[PDB]
Amino acid sequence: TTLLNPYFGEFGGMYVPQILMPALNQLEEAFVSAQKDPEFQAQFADLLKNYAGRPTALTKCQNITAGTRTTLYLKREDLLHGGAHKTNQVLGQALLAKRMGKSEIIAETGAGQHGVASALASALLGLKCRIYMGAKDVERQSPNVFRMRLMGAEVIPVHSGSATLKDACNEALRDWSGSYETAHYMLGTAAGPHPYPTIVREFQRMIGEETKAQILDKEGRLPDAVIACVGGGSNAIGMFADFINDTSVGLIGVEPGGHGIETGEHGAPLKHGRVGIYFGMKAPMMQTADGQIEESYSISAGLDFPSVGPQHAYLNSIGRADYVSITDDEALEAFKTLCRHEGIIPALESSHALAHALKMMREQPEKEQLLVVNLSGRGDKDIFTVHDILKARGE
Amino acid sequence: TTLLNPYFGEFGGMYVPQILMPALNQLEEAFVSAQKDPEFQAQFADLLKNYAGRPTALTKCQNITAGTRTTLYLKREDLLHGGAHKTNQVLGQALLAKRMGKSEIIAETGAGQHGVASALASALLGLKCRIYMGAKDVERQSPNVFRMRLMGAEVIPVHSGSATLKDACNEALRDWSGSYETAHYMLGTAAGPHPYPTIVREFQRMIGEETKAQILDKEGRLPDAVIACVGGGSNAIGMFADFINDTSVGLIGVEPGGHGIETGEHGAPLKHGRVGIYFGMKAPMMQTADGQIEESYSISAGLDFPSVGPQHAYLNSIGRADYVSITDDEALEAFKTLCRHEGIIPALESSHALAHALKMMREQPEKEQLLVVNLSGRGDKDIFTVHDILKARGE
Amino acid sequence: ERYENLFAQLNDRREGAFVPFVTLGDPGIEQSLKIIDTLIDAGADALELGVPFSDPLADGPTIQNANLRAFAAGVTPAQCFEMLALIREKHPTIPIGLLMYANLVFNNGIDAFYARCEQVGVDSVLVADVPVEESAPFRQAALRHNIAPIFICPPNADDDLLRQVASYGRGYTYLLSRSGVTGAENRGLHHLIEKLKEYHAAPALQGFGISSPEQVSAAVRAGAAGAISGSAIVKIIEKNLASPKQMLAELRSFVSAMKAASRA
Amino acid sequence: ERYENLFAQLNDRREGAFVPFVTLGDPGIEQSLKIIDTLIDAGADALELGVPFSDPLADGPTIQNANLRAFAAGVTPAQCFEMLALIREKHPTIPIGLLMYANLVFNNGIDAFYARCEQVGVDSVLVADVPVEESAPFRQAALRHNIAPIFICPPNADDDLLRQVASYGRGYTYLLSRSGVTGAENRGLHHLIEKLKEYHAAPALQGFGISSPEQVSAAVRAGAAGAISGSAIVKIIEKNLASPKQMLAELRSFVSAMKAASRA
Ligand SMILES: O=P(O)(O)OCCNS(=O)(=O)c1ccc(OC(F)(F)F)cc1
Ligand SMILES: O=P(O)(O)OCCNS(=O)(=O)c1ccc(OC(F)(F)F)cc1
Ligand SMILES: C=C(/N=C/c1c(COP(=O)(O)O)cnc(C)c1O)C(=O)O
Ligand SMILES: C=C(/N=C/c1c(COP(=O)(O)O)cnc(C)c1O)C(=O)O
Ligand SMILES: [Cs+]
Ligand SMILES: [Cs+]
Ligand SMILES: [Cs+]
Ligand SMILES: [Cs+]
Ligand SMILES: [Cs+]
Ligand SMILES: [Cs+]
């Protein structure tokens, strides 16, 4: 029994060990209470404005659309405190944790941006934070490990499995199943068991709300499409949510194609996996013929995850949103292009969204289209990875 | 002959080789023209808002003033695109460069934040950028070297002298003296020959303007004091300028004390040097008995400079602003304190200002005072330096 | 009716059940079959058997590593069902329960999974990451194929949950000793036991952190029908990988001692 | 009146001046004095001498490194004035000009600096980072102590600058060959020369990038009173640090050839 619908069509649910159901119900009740609480909303708004720096800019590209009929705006979540959109909903969930009388935080992280967000919110709001991170990600996103630890968070490398995001997720959930009486599990994406896909959407939806207001101010109309990368789905559903009922606005989500879909080394379950049950949810996943969960791959740690949030699977199934993929090399080209022609260093995650927008433009350069890309994070965490690659390719 | 006064009392002037005077006069005329040009001001404003992300937040500290009668706000220049206040005036000077028909940029950098700003503005506005950086700084601020180069700037290590900021300055000026017909020298601080101290102040003064509006909104009165670190002087004069005629508002500038003033290993010429002529200006400097320019020292590359902008020397001389120093260890403690108790990772430069504010509070904890610290940058560039230090100290 | 018959026999002897858990195919198919025959010969009243799964979220490191050993030996669910057929062919009455994760059941059809269970002679299935709230198609398929669906009673179960578990479950009720995941190193209630009896629930087996005879005796004295031990058993396997005969001897001693404690 | 007398003598012989630059104390005090005596013996008409400064902003790497060598030998401005006294004691009529950076002049009093210049017998001072716009206390102190203040005429000098340089300067006018900093590797105007003469400026010496006899001849043929060469000279010092006698021989050959070219 729940207050809110745990499903998006066939997808979603609460597929966790029985021991954790009361924690999930408690979280749902606290969220529903907080959403109607003017004092909670005021506190959340104040943190977003005066601490995190909202609203974020909407930047018109000056150079990369030259010679085409594409107008491109970037929603600048890279300018948020912490360096990514992750900070929005962590501030909200941290307030929920306090509301429920919890003093400890468990989080998982891949790119380290949710880890950094969790750590900074815990420092601000007086919570004890421990963060699981795959050992491969500890290496390729090292600047964020340093940032988390400087802010007093405990960072726990995970060496099992692929030593990436799904493995950090597993450990976080295992931890929570024994520590939920005192710890809140601050899940970092729009996935997992109900109520997390709903809470994460509602605490990220200011991205699309602001975007709509900003594009109406600057262009006097809605975008032809909004484009976002999709790991678990939080920055994309955050951008999408306020446009879902604007039927003329395209919603485009970009999964990581890794080395190419044909190689099987990717993170694109929505279009190339099949429905399964894992990480507390019924959702598309990368799985073997027998139903073992497959390891994903992406150059970007934040997209390196073998499933996807259930609301995206639903929006796809009814045709309201379209999903595509972008390979490592396509993302790297977009990264370089934004650096050199707009002076913005994007996260490699965000570079997948930008790459698809550039493709929409280049493939049909006389097509009139007004596009917004969600620039979900800055690329400081990625600059050593990208440098090593370019060097090992001449450049 | 100039349009504007090149001096602040005894300090300032245009002490450059004769060859460079027409370039300085041209720059002055272009600035005066641009300041009365509504189209220029609109373009500058648009970049500041929609590209750089102004206005920046004013954050009330929740935790670090507990148990005292100090109220502390941080002006969040760390949230500006690029990660520091440097971006403000680079956007303005880049527009001036274009206005003068220049297609090339020369810059010097120490912390690498002015370098990053110069590089991103050049990428955006279509300029060819070369950046001089001391070889010591190339090492201790390496993340910014990677960022500059990814954005297509040429970064030139300088091995002469102390291999830090003053040596990068020297090389930039030497370059300009031969390339001024096609290159604009984008000086990164409120120092050097007229008109740069004036231009840099006018293109940074939005910091104090915003601060005043924000503190009036939140507290209904002006601050008791505003506090900023001082390298060459740009973030401090940017914060100070709009308060200079508000006589009740204290202006406090914080020079780097390095290993301690008594060691001679510091960067605090305003209070511990004496007037000299160097880098195009008459200003306080660290110099030997014979008048050789001394090498400075600070743990923070952005403050590691043996002189100071002339307007600060003037404000000091008439008693309108007070200047103090903060040692390496004091700055490091402030860095750690902000990380762990407010969830903000500050630049080591900015940590000097914060350290002095914390001292004002701790020394007189029952003194009622409303303080603003200019948080001039974020500390991502510093996290590897700080980590290495803490490790080499237990921690 | 294998659980029903077992518990009736145990009740007439005033006895509790001891039920070991192992992972099927750990450390290899042949050695796993010998391990299981040893458990039974040493006095196991029933078995709980894991099918290796890539991401076992209710398991701690000991059983995580059991799954990995089985995968290193190339064990698949198909091979597990082959093993199950062989075990049942040898041992006609011992209740066999499977520990499953949802995706392995859901994968290519829930009904088809439980049908395969019935054909090889499995008696119960516990799906670890399906709470009662999501259980309808699983328990329906289970009952259609004469399989007992097993449900969990956690230490802080409210009355509604107690009533649901009593009504939906068959075979036995899993009485959770504590929160957390499986693990010997982490050791773990009369009110729950009495309430389950009041609501005519299947007999309760206590599990999680039971690694000593004293804990088994305590479970039965508190009124539980018996106890389950997994990690303690698996540790003996892990410790003796290079010494297969010593492995079986230590397994036999441990299982015999745990079973003796169930008579308290 | 040493410049006035020199240029009158050169004019009566229909001759241009050749004026070498070196850094005082490079590579050591004693070798520097021998270098300077060799320059004079080889035909130098006047000297331009640098006082080592920590941050010479108008100088390229060759003369930067000359300053560093002098500092490695422990050379101070006090020691430079000792050297100057010795040079003047040997050579009573040759014009001696100093290349100074502002802080060394300003340091402990502008007037006191020019007073020290007068006492040792210096004839001119060129302060490289003081433009005419900032020059008042410098040229006033210079004239009070019978020192010629030297000013720069850059290639793109406007008429106002030409008039100012003509009026303020004494001794000679420095005619800059090009923009940039000092350097042999970077080679560098009749209108400026004619205008300076029209305004009765001190006679023009062309400097920056003059490293060949051909350039000296070209300077004089264009109407300049002579030419200055620094980096070319200093390179010969740098090249022969381990061979002091070969150094002086190569210095002598070069200076003699450059002086010969001034007769064109
Ligand atoms: O002795 P331990 O600590 O290893 O515990 C052994 C348990 N093995 S099991 O098959 O009964 C078992 C039962 C339930 C489980 O998860 C659930 F409770 F969420 F459903 C996991 C394993
Ligand atoms: O032959 P080069 O290229 O080494 O040039 C030699 C010049 N040596 S100097 O003393 O006359 C000399 C003259 C003027 C200088 O700077 C100023 F023009 F800004 F004033 C610097 C050096
Ligand atoms: C998984 C992580 N990051 C994901 C991420 C993503 C993808 O996650 P979502 O689909 O939940 O937005 C996009 N952009 C940035 C900057 C990101 O850091 C993490 O930081 O833990
Ligand atoms: C010198 C540099 N930085 C100086 C700096 C300073 C000191 O320079 P000003 O005194 O000009 O603000 C303060 N804060 C930050 C973040 C800085 O990066 C540079 O980035 O080149
Ligand atoms: Cs366009
Ligand atoms: Cs994904
Ligand atoms: Cs995905
Ligand atoms: Cs306070
Ligand atoms: Cs300084
Ligand atoms: Cs200073």
CB D67 within 8 A of CB D53: yes
CA distance C101 to C108: 14
Handedness of CA D215, D216, D217, D222 (dihedral sign): positive
Residue nearest to atom 16 of ligand 3 (CA): A377
Residues with Cβ within 8 Å of A220's Cβ and at least 6 positions away in sequence, in order, are none
CA dist list (Å): D1 to A53, A336, B243, D8: 71, 66, 56, 11
CB A186 within 8 A of CB A108: no
Interface test with A, best of B46, B49, B50, B62 (most A CBs within 10 A): B50
Buried b vs exposed e over A84-96: b needs ≥16 C-beta within 10 Å?
A: bbbbbbbbbbbbb
AA letter at D37: D
Buried b vs exposed e over C91-118: b needs ≥16 C-beta within 10 Å?
A: beebbbbbbbbbbbbbbeebeebbebbe
Helical H segments across chain A, by residue range: 21-35, 38-46, 86-99, 113-125, 135-140, 142-150, 165-179, 196-202, 206-219, 234-240, 269-272, 310-317, 328-342, 348-363, 383-391
CA dist list (Å): B372 to A10, A303, C72, C198, C214: 53, 40, 62, 67, 65
CA distance B62 to A183: 23
Instruction: Show the domain range for A103.
Output: 8-52+86-204
CA distance D206 to D62: 19
- B280-285/B11-15 β-pairing: antiparallel
Q: Would you give the DSSP letter of residue C178? A: S
| A276 membership: H or E segment, kind and range | strand A274-278
Residue nearest to atom 16 of ligand 2 (CA): D128
CA distance A309 to A197: 7
Half-sphere exposure of D102 (CA within 13 A, CB side): 28
CA distance D90 to B132: 45
Tally the domains of chain B. Answer: 2
Quick one: B100 and B130 in the same domain?
yes
CA nearest B254: which of B234, B275, B282, B231?
B231
Structure tokens at B369: 């005072």
Experimental resolution (Å): 1.5
CA nearest D77: which of D47, D22, D116?
D116
Map chain B to HEC letters.
Answer: CCCCCCEECCEEEEECCHHHHHHHHHHHHHHHHHHCCHHHHHHHHHHHHHHHCCCCCEEECCCCCCCCCEEEEEEEHHHCCCCECHHHHHHHHHHHHHHCCCCEEEEEECCCHHHHHHHHHHHHHCCEEEEEEEHHHHHHCHHHHHHHHHCCCEEEEECCCCCCHHHHHHHHHHHHHHHCCCEEECCCCCCCCCCHHHHHHHCCCHHHHHHHHHHHHHHCCCCCEEEEECCCCHHHHHHHHHHCCCCCCEEEEEEEEECEHHHCECCCHHHHCEEEEECEEEEEECECCCCCECCCCCCCHHHCCCECCHHHHHHHHCCCEEEEEEEHHHHHHHHHHHHHHHCCCECHHHHHHHHHHHHHHHHCCCCCEEEEEEECEECHHHHHHHHHHHHCCCC
Instruction: Establish whether chain A is in contact with chain C, requiring a minimum of 3 CB pairs below 8 angstroms.
Output: yes
B175 touches A: beta carbon within 8 Å: no
Could you tell me how many helices (H) and strands (E) chain D has, helices first? 12, 9
Backbone angles phi, psi at D206, to 5 degrees: -85, 135
First and final C-alpha spacing in chain A: 58
CA nearest B229: which of B373, B70, B342, B78?
B373
Quick one: B232 and B375 in the same domain?
yes
Residues with Cβ within 8 Å of B390's Cβ and at least 6 positions away in sequence, in order, are B336
Quick one: A307 and A371 in the same domain?
yes
| C220 membership: H or E segment, kind and range | helix C213-221
CA distance D11 to B195: 44
Name beta bridge partners: A363. Answer: none
CA distance B26 to B99: 11
Helix (H, G, I), strand (E, B) or coil at C155: coil
CA dist list (Å): B318 to B10, B196, B202, B282: 11, 22, 21, 17
Q: Which of C30, C48, C129, C159 is catalytic?
A: C48
CA distance D254 to D264: 16
Best of A56, A75, A76, A86 for a ligand 3 pocket test (most atoms within 8 Å of beta carbon): A86
Q: Which of B18, B181, B290 sits opposite D131 (nearest CB)?
A: B18
Q: Which of A123, A341, A344 sits opposite B342 (nearest CB)?
A: A123
Quick one: A181 and A224 in the same domain?
no
- Looking up tokens 């381990």 gives D242
Instruction: Establish whether chain B is in contact with chain A, requiring a minimum of 3 CB pairs below 8 angstroms.
Output: yes
CB contact under 8 A, C131 and A18: yes
By C-alpha distance, the chain A residue nearest B56 is A53
Residues with Cβ within 8 Å of B345's Cβ and at least 6 positions away in sequence, in order, are A147, A150, A151, B335, B338, B339, B378, B379, B380, B383
Structure tokens at A208: 């699309």
For residue B388, the tally of other CB atoms under 10 A from its CB is: 11
CA nearest B224: which of B362, B366, B59, B70?
B70
Helix (H, G, I), strand (E, B) or coil at A107: strand
CA nearest B109: which of B43, B164, B59?
B164
CA distance C164 to C200: 11
CA distance B174 to B161: 15
Q: What's A226's domain CATH number?
A: 3.40.50.1100
CA distance B3 to B372: 34
Name beta bridge partners: A76. Answer: A375
CA nearest B393: which of B323, B303, B326, B332?
B332
Residues with Cβ within 8 Å of A215's Cβ and at least 6 positions away in sequence, in order, are A58, A73, A221, A222, A223, A370, A372
Q: How many residues does chain C have?
A: 264
Map D194-241 to HEC letters.
Answer: HHHHHCCCCCEEEECCCCCHHHHHHHHHCCCCEEEECHHHHHHHHHCC
CA distance B342 to A326: 38
Domain boundary pick from B142, B173, B204: B204
CA dist list (Å): C182 to A45, A184, B28, C185: 42, 21, 75, 9
Handedness of CA B134, B135, B139, B143 (dihedral sign): positive
Q: Where are the domains of chain C?
A: 1-264
Quick one: B132 and B222 in the same domain?
no
CB C121 within 8 A of CB C81: no
CA distance B110 to B137: 6
Residue A19 lies in a domain: yes
CB < 8 Å to C78, chain A: 290
Map B334-360 to HEC letters.
Answer: HHHHHHHHHCCCECHHHHHHHHHHHHH
CA distance B45 to B51: 10
Catalytic positions of A are 61, 85
Q: Is the peptide bond before B365 cis (omega within 30 degrees of 0)?
A: no
CB C94 within 8 A of CB C9: no
- Looking up tokens 């943190």 gives A47
CA distance C19 to C98: 12
CA distance D231 to D259: 16
Quick one: B189 and B324 in the same domain?
no
Interface test with A, best of B105, B124, B372, B375 (most A CBs within 10 A): B124
Interface test with B, best of A48, A63, A383 (most B CBs within 10 A): A383
Gap from B217 CA to chain A (nearest CA, Å): 12
CB D211 within 8 A of CB D229: yes
3-state percent helix, strand, coil for chain A, nearest multiple of 5: 45, 20, 30
Q: How far is the CA of D56 from the centre of ligand 2 (A)?
A: 10
Structure tokens at A154: 């405990």
Domain boundary pick from A153, A181, A204: A204
D219 lines ligand 2 (CB under 6 A): no
Structure tokens at B287: 């110099």
Quick one: A304 and A192 in the same domain?
no
Structure tokens at D241: 């640090």
| Nearest-5° Cα angle at B19, B13 to B23 | 65
Quick one: B171 and B80 in the same domain?
no
Q: Is the peptide bond before A269 cis (omega within 30 degrees of 0)?
A: no
Residue A90 lies in a domain: yes
CB B53 within 8 A of CB A76: yes
For residue B121, the tally of other CB atoms under 10 A from its CB is: 31
Quick one: B152 and B76 in the same domain?
no
CB A195 within 8 A of CB A24: yes
CA dist list (Å): D117 to D5, D50, D172: 19, 13, 17
Quick one: B228 and B127 in the same domain?
no
CA distance D25 to D53: 12
Using N-to-C axis directions, what is the helix angle for B113-125 and B86-99, rounded to 10°? Answer: 40
Instruction: Establish whether chain D is in contact with chain A, requiring a minimum of 3 CB pairs below 8 angstroms.
Output: no
Quick one: A267 and A135 in the same domain?
no
CB B54 within 8 A of CB B204: no
| A189 membership: H or E segment, kind and range | none
Q: Which residues of A touch C (CB under 8 A)?
A: 1, 13-19, 21-22, 160-161, 166, 170, 173-174, 177-181, 276-280, 282, 287, 290-293
| Nearest-5° Cα angle at B55, B51 to B58 | 140
Residue B395 lies in a domain: no
Residue A347 lies in a domain: yes
Quick one: A375 and A235 in the same domain?
yes
CA nearest B302: which of B145, B137, B154?
B137
Structure tokens at D251: 């210095």
Backbone angles phi, psi at B168, to 5 degrees: -65, -40
Strand order in the sheet with B128-134: B154-158, B128-134, B104-109, B183-185
CA nearest A109: which of A151, A141, A81?
A141
CA distance C212 to C217: 9
Could you tell me how many helices (H) and strands (E) chain A has, helices first? 15, 14
| Nearest-5° Cα angle at B313, B311 to B314 | 60
Q: Would you give the DSSP letter of residue A161? A: T
Nearest ligand to the CA of A118 is: 3
CA distance B260 to B329: 9
How buried is residue B363: exposed, middle or buried, by Cβ count under 10 Å (0-12/13-18/19+)?
exposed
CA distance B116 to C226: 69
CA distance B131 to B109: 7
Domain boundary pick from B189, B204, B219: B204
Residues with Cβ within 8 Å of C137's Cβ and at least 6 positions away in sequence, in order, are C110
CA dist list (Å): B13 to A26, A244, B200, D132: 68, 61, 15, 12
Q: Is the peptide bond before B22 cis (omega within 30 degrees of 0)?
A: no
Which partners does chain C have (≥3 C-beta pairs < 8 Å)? A
The reply to whether C160 belongs to the active site is no
CA dist list (Å): A30 to A26, A92, A100: 6, 12, 7
CA dist list (Å): A375 to A74, A91, B232, D164: 6, 20, 34, 58
| Nearest-5° Cα angle at D237, D233 to D238 | 110
Helix (H, G, I), strand (E, B) or coil at C27: coil
Map D123-160 to HEC letters.
Answer: CEEEECCCCHHHCHHHHHHHHHCCCEECCEECCCCCHH
Helix (H, G, I), strand (E, B) or coil at D74: coil
CA distance A122 to A116: 10
Pocket of ligand 3 (CB under 6 A): A 84, 86, 109-115, 165, 188-189, 229-236, 302-303, 347, 349-350, 376-377
